[PDB]
Structures are given as structure tokens and as C-alpha cells.
Amino acid sequence: KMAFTLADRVTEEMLADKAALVVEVVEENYHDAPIVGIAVVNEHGRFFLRPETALADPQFVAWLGDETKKKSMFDSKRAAVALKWKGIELCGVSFDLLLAAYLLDPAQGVDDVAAAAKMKQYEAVRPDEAVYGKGAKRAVPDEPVLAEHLVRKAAAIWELERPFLDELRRNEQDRLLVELEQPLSSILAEMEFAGVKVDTKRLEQMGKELAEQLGTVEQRIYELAGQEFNINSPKQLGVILFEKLQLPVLKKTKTGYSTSADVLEKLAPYHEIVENILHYRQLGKLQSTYIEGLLKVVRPATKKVHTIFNQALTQTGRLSSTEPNLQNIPIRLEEGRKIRQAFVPSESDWLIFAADYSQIELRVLAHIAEDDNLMEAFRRDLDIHTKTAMDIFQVSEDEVTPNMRRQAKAVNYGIVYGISDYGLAQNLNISRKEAAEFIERYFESFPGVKRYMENIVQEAKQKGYVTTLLHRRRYLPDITSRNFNVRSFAERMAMNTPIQGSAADIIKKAMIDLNARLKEERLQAHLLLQVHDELILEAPKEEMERLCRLVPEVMEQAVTLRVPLKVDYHYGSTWYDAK
DNA sequence: GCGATCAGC
DNA sequence: ACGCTGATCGCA
Ligand SMILES: Nc1nc2c(ncn2[C@H]2C[C@H](O)[C@@H](COP(=O)(O)OP(=O)(O)OP(=O)(O)O)O2)c(=O)[nH]1
Ligand SMILES: [Ca+2]
């Protein structure tokens, strides 16, 4: 029902200077994954190519790598990385339908061509799940069915580029697609393919030491409980704490007793078993998520882990990191931080270099709210978390402990993003009236932030959405809901999304500028990871001194705000030593 | 499969 | 009853 050539060899009319291209990788993790078929739609017609012929054809490989042969695609990073694993470079991607749909409305959750096409009343393509199936029944269909599906996706990309670009233009997002998200997609492809080297000997040794510490703590828990149980059984654990030992019940879940760490910490005066349960959970989290989980995904021959940065998933424009998630590697507790000693440079005599924005969301807030006092604080390069810690605990600067500062950091973000006196009192273990008076004093120091937060909620009600500094958009239909709780969540999204999303925009532009600068200086240094407000690179030891001046400057100059941007940086022999 | 939990930002 | 995530695991 759609005409196409099931081609046996590559022809010159397949290599036009503008085409929709489909390079199909069905496996969810596309690293080293098979390419199961290729489709090309252009002015001369529609073509399906088998990969084992197309990707060994030197003219087709040449066409893929030619920047001047422009390709429209959906999820071009998936294609670029799968091709890198075949030794083939993809260049010239000038339109990515996945990123275009994500920019127009992140809430759509668009994850295949059919879902994007449905945004523009295009329905002549099937969902990928309808073609490949679900779960244990998932499979590549017979060639004619596959070929028609890939050609139909290519034809959809071909037809949808103009209406998508037109809507992007009306939203002031066309440069956001073409100058920011699409260039970043190629950089992420390089980072994912490069991978991060892991010291598996060290991780395995930690895993063994962890397993015996686990056993010890576990016996102590059974000892303190007077019996044995499944410490991870909510029913049994709840039964132990709140029925056998008769500890107060401070919180319930939909299903029974809460045993979250904040509850257990509040029960510490009542019984020393809860501190052991906490320690046990923390150890088991390291063991199962970061020891076993990381060893499971390491490529054995290179000792590299290859994350996938999801660029079209979060509602604020942040990236996420999957399989493994390299944006939530422990750092907070010393036992957990040592996991980072296992993350090492990929060559000998190279080092890890890490640079991060200091308080970028609060600096962005000061700029957007034009709050006189908050702008002055950052113009003085004040550490607002220490200053808040001094006010909370009524101490002087040198008397601000690391834990006090971490607490004040959650007070700072909490208050500007709408925490209530109740939530603040519960976090600081102060009276609710004290917490409310503190919040009042906080907005007396920062009335521009208060005004901005009231204004942005009203702007979302009027427009139906909020935007970031680089014109990312989030629709907030619930902000006019009649249910108070549904409305309130939407109001806090209107307060938070433009700030968190603008900080996401800035670091993305910084990455693009950084790569252009590394290329211009002819450095071997390259990005490995982004962790929201941090960039992690590796480079020859002999490049570190140049990177100490280059990277912070690139990051600080990514945008110009009414307050300066501030970058801290470290380097060392492992990721551990680079912070 | 989902909710609770917890690791990061 | 501040926000944004992903992985594990028990299932009340
Ligand atoms: N709403 C909220 N956001 C947070 C919280 N903690 C971190 N974030 C987000 C906001 C920012 O995008 C980013 C900043 O967190 P960081 O740990 O990097 O601390 P920050 O830069 O504020 O200070 P520091 O690095 O310690 O000088 O992470 C929090 O408790 N609540
Ligand atoms: Ca930071």
C-alpha cells in the first residue's frame, strides 16, 4: 500500500543531497546492536536496503559520512551510535523528528515515528510496537513487512519536517532544535560510544568486602530484633518495628507502614536497630546497583561502560542516563564515594577532569526574577547554602559543618520551589510556626523571587505553558484544575521548570561550545559524561593545565546573565580524585 | 508491572 | 505538603 524499491544494490539516485533516512535498530540499548534494515526516501523515490549490502557499499558509506548530504531522521543518535559500532560515521543530519516533537511538547512522550506523526494528523505509519511486538514475543518481522514499515517511517519523516519546523518557528524554538539539540545529539553520540573505563578488579574487591560487611550488619539486626526476618520485606520489617518493638508510627504508605530513611532517622532515639537497618540498606544499595549492576553492563574486552543519554525524555529539558545510569553514582557517603575510584581514564597517562556550575539554578533564578538582593549575593560570589546554614543553625561561617550545609541546600531549593511550613518543619525538625516564620523572612530578604513565583504561576494560567531562557516549553494543563492538590503540583512545576530547564539549556550550550573549542585548540581531551550541572572529561596528563583555563571559561561564557556564572573544577587519576 | 525506596543533580 | 530523574526489589 506504499510503493518502494526493495533494492538489491545501491544506486546513484539513492544518494541525493536531501533524504529521509531510517537506520533501524530494534534493540532498546543500541550499543553494538544489529542494524536490521535501511530505508531512504528522497525526490527520486523510496528505497529499502539490506544493511549487509548497503553498509559494505563504499558509495553508500561515503554518502552517510558526507556532511553536505543532508538527512532527516527520527532519533539520529541511535542510528549514529549503532553505525559507530559498525565503524561507520554518520554526518549531515539536518532534521531529527524525535527532538522536534520533544521540543514542541515533551509530555507527548513521543518515542516512535507514529507518535510524532500523530501530532500532525499523519497516520500512514504504524507504531513500532505493533510491528515488532512486546516482550518475549518481540521479533523482527519478515522482510516485506519490515521493508514497508521502514519506508513508511521514512516517508513520514520526509512529509513531517516542514510542518514541524513551522510550528517550531512559531514557538521560537527552531534555533533551539537546529543550533542546540541537534548539535548536542552528535556530541552525546560521541560520549556514549567512547564510554567510561571501569577498574573491574577494584569493583570486584569492593563487592567482596561489601558482602561480608552486609553479613555482619545483618546478624546485628537479627540480634537487635531478637529474631530473623526478610529485612527487605516491608510487611516483616514493619511488623518488627511497629508491632514487635512497638515503635511509633510516624507515616503510612498506600500499602502499610512507611520505613523510608527519613522515618527511620526520626526513630533513632527509640531503638538502635533503625540505624542498622539504614546502614544495611545503604550497603545493599551499593552492592546491587553499583557493584553488581555495573559489572553486569561492563563490556569485558575493553572494561568500558556505555551509557545512553536520553535526550528526549525529561519534562524540563535535562538529560537522563540509562543502563547504566552514570548520573547517580554515589558520592555522598564515604563508603559510597569509593565506587568512583573504579571510574578511570581510558588510556595510560590520561586523567579525569570534572567541572561544575556552582548554584546555577539559583543564579538563573536571580537573573530571571531580577531580585536585587539575590543578584547582589551572587555578584559577591556568596555561597548561599553556607549563608543559609549560618542563619538556620545560628552559627558563624567556620562553624558551618558539611551536614549543616547539605541541610541548608535543601532549604534553599525547597523554599523557592514552594515547600510548605509543614515540609520545612519536618525537614529541620522545628516547630511548624518557626518554619513558617523562616519562610516569611526568606521572602522578605528576596521579595523579587516571591513576586516572580506569583507572576510565573499567573503567566502559566494565561498562556497554558511556561518556557525556559532558550524557549523550551512545558504545557501545564493542570494549572487550572479544580482539584486543589492537582492544581498545586502544577503551580510548583511552573515555579521549577523554567529554572531547572534554563540551567539545562545553559549546560547544553556549554557542551557545544566546549567541543568546538577543544577542536580549535587541537586537544585530545573529550567529554565523557554530563551530570546536569557538571561536565566530566578525560585527557592526556599534558593537557590538564590548558583545560584548567579552557573549560571553566567556556562554561562561564556559555550565556551572559545579570549575575556571573561560577565554575569549580578538579582533576585526578580517577573520577573519585576529580572531586 | 507498580510502588516504595534511595542513588544523584 | 520543594523539583527532575533511573535501578532495585518485594508485592501489604
Ligand atoms: N528542587 C531541588 N533541586 C535540587 C536539590 N538538590 C539539587 N537540586 C538541583 C538543582 C540544581 O539543578 C542542581 C544543584 O545541586 P548541587 O548539588 O550541584 O548543589 P549547588 O550547585 O546548589 O551547590 P554546590 O555545588 O554544593 O556549591 O541540582 C533539591 O533538594 N531540591
Ligand atoms: Ca554544582
XYZ file of C-alpha atoms in Angstrom, chain A:
579
model
C 0.000 0.000 0.000
C 3.088 2.227 -0.344
C 5.304 1.930 -3.395
C 9.008 1.353 -2.893
C 12.027 -0.348 -4.403
C 13.342 -3.309 -2.443
C 16.770 -2.677 -3.870
C 19.438 -5.328 -4.350
C 22.318 -2.849 -4.701
C 22.901 0.839 -4.036
C 22.188 3.195 -6.944
C 23.150 6.809 -7.544
C 19.570 8.009 -7.177
C 19.633 6.758 -3.564
C 22.467 9.207 -2.782
C 20.641 12.517 -3.291
C 21.678 15.596 -1.362
C 18.492 15.558 0.751
C 16.825 12.423 2.068
C 14.826 10.949 4.885
C 16.894 8.108 6.322
C 15.893 5.245 8.562
C 18.660 3.073 10.017
C 16.670 0.615 12.077
C 17.950 -0.618 15.453
C 15.195 -2.535 17.249
C 17.092 -3.376 20.453
C 16.382 -0.796 23.135
C 20.030 -0.483 24.122
C 21.514 0.388 20.741
C 25.187 -0.107 21.731
C 26.687 -2.802 19.473
C 23.180 -3.614 18.320
C 22.266 -5.061 14.927
C 21.029 -2.769 12.218
C 18.099 -4.696 10.746
C 17.259 -2.577 7.721
C 17.669 0.757 5.986
C 15.163 2.957 4.189
C 15.786 6.070 2.097
C 13.086 8.422 0.817
C 14.079 11.264 -1.452
C 12.954 13.182 -4.537
C 13.685 10.150 -6.731
C 11.574 7.636 -4.820
C 11.523 5.268 -1.877
C 14.120 2.586 -1.238
C 14.693 -0.254 1.194
C 18.259 -1.548 1.526
C 19.515 -4.604 3.367
C 22.253 -3.493 5.771
C 24.736 -6.229 4.845
C 24.842 -4.874 1.303
C 24.266 -1.157 1.941
C 26.810 -0.729 4.758
C 29.532 -2.541 2.795
C 28.930 -0.341 -0.269
C 31.637 2.346 -0.393
C 29.380 4.891 -2.130
C 26.644 4.489 0.478
C 29.151 4.654 3.332
C 30.617 7.753 1.699
C 27.141 9.279 1.389
C 26.393 8.607 5.061
C 29.580 10.384 6.153
C 29.210 13.419 3.862
C 28.084 16.496 5.850
C 26.731 18.067 2.642
C 24.264 15.204 2.025
C 21.505 16.224 4.397
C 19.487 13.544 6.184
C 16.170 13.818 8.005
C 15.753 11.155 10.682
C 13.991 10.111 13.865
C 16.364 9.501 16.821
C 19.518 10.091 14.821
C 21.724 9.453 17.870
C 20.528 5.843 17.991
C 21.471 5.498 14.307
C 24.827 7.314 14.664
C 25.918 5.196 17.644
C 24.806 1.896 16.076
C 26.738 2.916 12.951
C 29.812 3.895 15.008
C 29.746 0.319 16.330
C 29.862 -0.789 12.667
C 32.825 1.529 12.039
C 30.718 3.956 10.004
C 30.355 7.694 10.545
C 27.001 9.384 10.042
C 27.092 13.115 9.281
C 24.762 15.635 7.718
C 21.718 15.056 9.953
C 19.760 18.289 9.413
C 16.407 17.346 10.980
C 15.635 14.975 13.865
C 11.925 14.355 14.227
C 12.278 12.977 17.753
C 13.898 16.147 19.046
C 11.442 18.331 17.123
C 8.497 16.577 18.795
C 10.169 16.680 22.198
C 10.630 20.456 21.873
C 7.014 21.017 20.762
C 5.622 19.075 23.691
C 7.728 16.878 25.990
C 4.591 15.482 27.647
C 3.634 13.567 24.498
C 6.275 11.007 25.432
C 6.983 10.593 21.720
C 9.161 7.521 21.358
C 8.399 6.429 17.802
C 7.691 7.954 14.419
C 3.991 7.093 14.582
C 3.561 9.037 17.839
C 5.250 12.111 16.361
C 3.257 11.799 13.110
C 0.013 11.675 15.102
C 0.818 15.195 16.344
C 0.252 16.422 12.764
C -2.644 14.105 11.800
C -0.303 11.834 9.838
C -1.320 8.229 10.407
C 0.146 6.356 7.405
C 2.789 4.605 9.532
C 2.405 2.045 12.259
C 3.699 2.194 15.847
C 6.934 0.243 16.261
C 5.346 -1.936 18.952
C 2.637 -3.005 16.508
C 5.348 -4.184 14.107
C 7.916 -5.715 16.457
C 5.630 -6.888 19.270
C 6.116 -6.731 23.026
C 8.402 -8.504 25.466
C 9.031 -12.205 24.882
C 7.140 -12.053 21.560
C 9.333 -9.204 20.254
C 10.843 -10.035 16.877
C 11.909 -8.576 13.546
C 9.101 -9.304 11.063
C 9.526 -10.868 7.643
C 11.463 -8.680 5.194
C 8.499 -7.303 3.157
C 6.710 -6.286 6.347
C 9.894 -4.763 7.772
C 10.713 -3.029 4.487
C 7.277 -1.428 4.269
C 7.461 -0.298 7.875
C 10.874 1.348 7.454
C 9.870 3.027 4.181
C 6.630 4.282 5.785
C 8.622 5.763 8.668
C 10.995 7.378 6.157
C 8.066 8.761 4.143
C 6.565 10.186 7.341
C 9.843 11.912 8.284
C 10.004 13.266 4.711
C 6.480 14.708 4.958
C 6.610 15.919 8.552
C 9.776 18.028 8.517
C 8.108 21.152 7.138
C 5.054 21.270 9.468
C 7.251 20.507 12.478
C 9.758 23.215 11.526
C 6.875 25.643 11.009
C 5.483 25.033 14.465
C 8.979 25.217 15.958
C 9.438 28.603 14.272
C 6.159 29.961 15.682
C 7.288 28.817 19.142
C 10.733 30.496 18.792
C 12.240 27.008 19.048
C 13.671 26.465 15.548
C 17.141 27.598 16.585
C 16.760 25.569 19.771
C 16.372 22.482 17.553
C 18.995 23.263 14.921
C 21.701 25.097 16.879
C 21.355 23.337 20.237
C 19.570 19.983 20.428
C 20.689 18.525 17.095
C 24.367 19.503 17.551
C 24.204 18.166 21.117
C 22.848 14.848 19.813
C 26.065 14.301 17.831
C 28.176 15.150 20.909
C 26.227 12.701 23.072
C 26.725 10.050 20.388
C 30.495 10.536 20.693
C 30.339 10.428 24.502
C 28.224 7.264 24.594
C 30.393 5.480 22.041
C 33.610 6.492 23.823
C 32.340 5.017 27.089
C 33.951 5.215 30.524
C 36.634 2.755 31.592
C 35.997 0.870 34.824
C 38.502 -0.804 37.166
C 36.775 -4.162 37.471
C 39.394 -5.582 39.840
C 38.721 -2.757 42.283
C 34.929 -3.049 41.947
C 35.074 -6.811 42.432
C 37.221 -6.417 45.549
C 34.748 -3.833 46.899
C 31.929 -6.249 46.145
C 33.533 -8.961 48.232
C 34.302 -6.635 51.148
C 30.735 -5.311 50.945
C 29.242 -8.802 51.060
C 30.921 -9.584 54.369
C 30.088 -6.209 55.921
C 26.494 -6.931 54.856
C 26.518 -10.258 56.713
C 27.854 -8.657 59.898
C 25.270 -5.851 59.935
C 22.566 -8.364 59.048
C 23.332 -10.539 62.082
C 23.350 -7.456 64.305
C 19.863 -6.574 63.009
C 18.521 -10.076 63.704
C 20.243 -9.793 67.092
C 18.583 -6.448 67.862
C 15.232 -7.720 66.571
C 15.521 -10.881 68.677
C 14.701 -12.944 65.572
C 15.317 -13.389 61.843
C 13.235 -11.943 59.014
C 13.479 -10.602 55.474
C 14.872 -7.144 56.247
C 13.698 -6.100 52.774
C 10.143 -7.364 53.382
C 8.009 -4.261 54.085
C 5.452 -6.444 55.865
C 8.037 -8.218 58.035
C 10.096 -5.063 58.629
C 7.004 -3.050 59.529
C 5.894 -5.912 61.770
C 9.272 -5.885 63.510
C 9.472 -2.128 64.026
C 5.873 -1.114 64.655
C 4.380 -4.262 66.248
C 7.146 -6.310 67.889
C 9.315 -3.395 69.047
C 6.255 -1.083 69.206
C 7.977 1.941 67.669
C 5.727 4.951 66.967
C 4.144 5.089 63.519
C 5.140 8.412 62.006
C 3.864 7.825 58.452
C 1.876 5.361 56.360
C 2.014 4.403 52.708
C -0.766 3.293 50.376
C 0.153 -0.227 51.483
C 1.127 -0.023 55.163
C 3.879 1.326 57.399
C 6.456 3.661 55.931
C 10.106 2.775 56.542
C 11.725 5.471 54.422
C 15.057 6.766 55.693
C 13.519 9.999 56.973
C 11.161 7.948 59.168
C 13.960 5.663 60.374
C 16.146 8.644 61.257
C 13.333 10.046 63.410
C 13.039 6.701 65.236
C 16.739 6.622 66.175
C 16.155 7.825 69.789
C 13.802 4.867 70.294
C 15.944 1.911 69.193
C 19.384 1.418 67.672
C 18.064 -1.197 65.226
C 16.900 1.531 62.820
C 20.415 2.870 62.345
C 21.489 -0.690 61.498
C 18.624 -1.062 59.003
C 19.761 2.206 57.384
C 23.363 1.002 57.191
C 22.144 -2.333 55.812
C 20.087 -0.683 53.080
C 22.943 1.619 52.101
C 25.329 -1.325 51.812
C 22.836 -3.379 49.819
C 22.215 -0.420 47.508
C 25.929 -0.195 46.742
C 26.164 -3.942 46.248
C 23.167 -4.462 43.996
C 23.038 -1.236 41.983
C 26.627 -0.061 41.710
C 28.758 -3.189 42.119
C 26.685 -5.956 40.562
C 24.777 -3.636 38.251
C 27.894 -2.003 36.871
C 29.761 -5.290 36.448
C 26.763 -6.603 34.547
C 26.991 -3.840 31.913
C 30.760 -3.572 31.534
C 31.980 -4.639 28.117
C 34.525 -7.266 29.204
C 37.113 -6.829 26.437
C 37.529 -3.051 26.889
C 36.315 -2.652 30.504
C 34.108 0.232 29.320
C 30.517 1.055 30.265
C 28.482 2.789 27.563
C 25.535 4.686 28.959
C 22.697 6.027 26.848
C 21.852 9.677 27.410
C 18.118 10.068 26.824
C 17.799 13.494 25.263
C 14.036 13.449 24.644
C 12.640 12.192 27.943
C 12.621 14.681 30.834
C 9.899 17.299 31.148
C 12.391 20.105 31.887
C 14.992 19.529 29.174
C 17.539 17.748 31.349
C 19.176 14.614 30.052
C 18.738 11.289 31.749
C 21.214 8.413 31.767
C 20.287 4.756 31.396
C 21.834 1.269 31.586
C 23.911 2.168 33.488
C 22.751 5.431 34.929
C 26.030 7.317 35.314
C 24.345 10.436 36.719
C 23.620 8.904 40.118
C 26.950 7.259 41.045
C 27.395 7.651 44.827
C 29.459 10.473 46.299
C 27.591 11.478 49.453
C 28.816 8.871 51.957
C 32.476 7.914 52.069
C 31.696 4.212 51.612
C 29.655 5.014 48.505
C 32.053 7.612 47.132
C 34.810 4.973 46.781
C 32.789 3.431 43.924
C 34.104 6.412 41.965
C 37.670 5.145 42.352
C 36.673 2.448 39.862
C 35.990 5.010 37.108
C 39.323 5.606 35.403
C 40.783 7.197 32.273
C 40.606 5.072 29.158
C 44.348 5.372 28.392
C 47.501 5.330 30.458
C 48.850 8.771 31.385
C 45.406 10.315 30.907
C 43.435 11.912 33.719
C 39.789 12.689 34.563
C 38.810 16.386 34.592
C 35.490 17.477 36.162
C 33.914 20.949 36.104
C 30.583 22.009 37.540
C 28.463 25.125 37.841
C 28.084 26.396 41.405
C 24.414 27.073 42.294
C 23.402 27.581 38.679
C 19.668 27.268 39.329
C 19.747 30.000 41.980
C 21.868 32.226 39.736
C 19.383 31.635 36.907
C 16.555 32.427 39.361
C 18.266 35.681 40.385
C 18.569 36.649 36.738
C 15.009 35.730 35.763
C 13.389 37.179 38.866
C 15.698 40.241 38.807
C 15.700 40.037 42.596
C 18.019 42.830 43.800
C 19.269 41.003 46.902
C 19.752 37.633 45.221
C 21.624 39.205 42.334
C 23.843 41.068 44.803
C 24.600 37.809 46.682
C 25.894 36.144 43.522
C 27.727 39.258 42.359
C 29.559 38.914 45.689
C 30.007 35.207 44.820
C 28.361 34.343 48.117
C 27.815 30.661 48.858
C 24.099 30.880 49.549
C 23.987 27.383 51.069
C 26.577 28.299 53.716
C 24.866 31.661 54.339
C 21.523 29.916 54.821
C 23.168 27.335 57.079
C 24.530 30.157 59.258
C 21.015 31.592 59.597
C 19.277 28.273 60.321
C 21.669 26.917 62.948
C 22.588 30.412 64.230
C 26.331 29.839 63.765
C 29.283 31.574 62.116
C 30.804 30.533 58.807
C 33.672 28.358 60.068
C 31.135 26.696 62.387
C 29.021 25.593 59.394
C 29.505 21.835 59.210
C 29.258 19.871 55.944
C 25.976 18.339 57.092
C 24.525 21.729 58.046
C 25.283 22.984 54.530
C 23.637 19.978 52.885
C 20.557 20.647 55.008
C 20.547 24.345 54.101
C 20.869 23.414 50.424
C 17.541 21.584 50.583
C 16.065 24.563 52.442
C 17.171 26.962 49.694
C 15.810 24.922 46.789
C 12.808 23.883 48.881
C 11.713 27.410 49.699
C 11.993 28.837 46.188
C 10.209 25.820 44.676
C 7.267 26.101 47.053
C 7.976 23.975 50.130
C 5.339 24.459 52.855
C 5.872 25.268 56.523
C 4.926 21.650 57.232
C 7.514 20.214 54.860
C 10.134 22.664 56.078
C 9.415 21.926 59.742
C 9.634 18.187 59.064
C 12.987 18.695 57.317
C 14.525 20.905 60.009
C 12.691 19.341 62.999
C 11.460 22.734 64.091
C 8.009 23.889 65.022
C 5.692 24.494 62.108
C 5.207 28.098 63.220
C 9.001 28.545 63.248
C 9.264 27.089 59.748
C 6.528 29.431 58.501
C 8.218 32.446 60.082
C 11.507 31.441 58.464
C 9.834 31.212 55.045
C 8.324 34.663 55.612
C 11.754 36.055 56.489
C 13.225 34.318 53.459
C 10.883 36.132 51.086
C 11.416 39.387 52.980
C 15.079 39.084 52.000
C 14.068 38.039 48.452
C 10.787 39.774 47.558
C 11.655 39.687 43.862
C 11.734 35.896 43.975
C 8.351 35.881 45.723
C 6.890 38.218 43.087
C 8.402 36.157 40.271
C 6.894 32.966 41.685
C 3.435 34.589 41.869
C 3.841 36.058 38.387
C 5.000 32.865 36.739
C 2.022 30.887 38.083
C -0.342 33.506 36.632
C 1.592 33.526 33.352
C 1.212 29.751 33.103
C -2.534 30.067 33.741
C -2.845 32.654 30.969
C -0.577 31.049 28.365
C -1.107 27.385 29.227
C 2.648 26.709 29.426
C 5.943 28.009 30.805
C 9.225 28.482 28.955
C 12.961 28.459 29.653
C 15.516 31.104 28.650
C 16.231 29.282 25.377
C 12.490 28.784 24.697
C 11.970 25.227 25.840
C 8.294 24.850 26.695
C 6.264 22.784 29.131
C 2.470 22.685 28.931
C 0.734 22.760 32.306
C -2.964 21.951 31.722
C -3.413 21.035 35.391
C -2.657 24.586 36.500
C -6.369 25.424 36.056
C -7.608 22.227 37.682
C -10.370 22.425 40.251
C -8.758 19.808 42.495
C -6.543 21.809 44.841
C -3.788 19.193 45.023
C -3.593 18.694 41.239
C -3.517 22.453 40.750
C -0.837 22.876 43.427
C 1.534 20.347 41.828
C 1.103 22.185 38.536
C 1.878 25.507 40.240
C 5.122 24.151 41.653
C 6.052 22.906 38.171
C 5.519 26.443 36.881
C 7.905 27.685 39.598
C 10.556 24.978 38.979
C 10.554 24.093 35.244
C 11.746 27.444 33.802
C 14.638 27.496 36.270
C 15.754 23.873 36.100
C 15.145 23.857 32.352
C 17.148 27.062 31.779
C 20.074 25.552 33.701
C 19.714 22.511 31.419
C 19.763 24.810 28.364
C 22.941 26.526 29.564
C 24.982 23.388 30.172
C 23.917 22.012 26.770
C 25.166 25.156 25.063
C 28.336 24.934 27.126
C 28.952 21.403 25.839
C 28.566 22.543 22.223
C 30.922 25.486 22.790
C 33.396 23.275 24.643
C 33.598 20.737 21.825
C 34.161 23.481 19.246
C 36.919 24.945 21.415
C 38.667 21.595 22.030
C 38.661 21.055 18.273
C 40.039 24.545 17.598
C 42.861 24.055 20.133
C 43.531 20.573 18.619
C 43.277 18.907 22.025
C 42.797 15.176 22.579
C 40.538 15.868 25.615
C 36.929 14.729 25.163
C 33.690 14.732 27.129
C 32.719 11.505 28.885
C 29.660 12.454 30.962
C 27.241 15.217 31.766
C 25.684 15.189 35.225
C 23.117 18.028 34.919
C 25.377 20.893 36.027
C 28.709 19.034 35.667
C 30.886 18.012 32.718
C 33.385 15.166 33.048
C 36.210 14.861 30.543
C 39.313 12.747 30.139
C 42.534 13.934 28.526
C 46.303 13.353 28.377
C 48.018 14.455 31.585
C 49.924 17.028 29.495
C 46.645 18.827 28.569
C 45.338 19.370 32.130
C 46.882 22.806 32.651
C 45.327 24.097 29.447
C 41.961 22.558 30.380
C 42.027 24.288 33.790
C 41.745 27.581 31.943
C 39.780 26.481 28.904
C 36.864 24.510 30.378
C 35.737 26.899 33.165
C 35.910 29.832 30.757
C 33.845 28.062 28.085
C 31.269 27.106 30.709
C 31.142 30.555 32.335
C 30.739 32.233 28.958
C 28.010 29.897 27.656
C 25.388 32.579 28.304
C 25.515 36.074 29.709
C 23.215 36.610 32.689
C 22.700 39.566 35.029
C 24.885 37.625 37.516
C 28.118 35.742 36.759
C 28.275 32.024 36.266
C 30.772 30.273 38.525
C 32.533 27.009 37.674
C 34.541 24.791 40.037
C 36.895 22.182 38.621
C 39.183 19.365 39.748
C 41.172 16.639 38.073
C 42.918 13.467 39.110
C 43.609 9.814 38.390
C 40.024 8.605 38.872
C 36.585 10.184 38.979
C 36.925 9.973 42.787
C 40.050 12.157 42.700
C 38.432 14.689 40.333
C 36.141 15.971 43.108
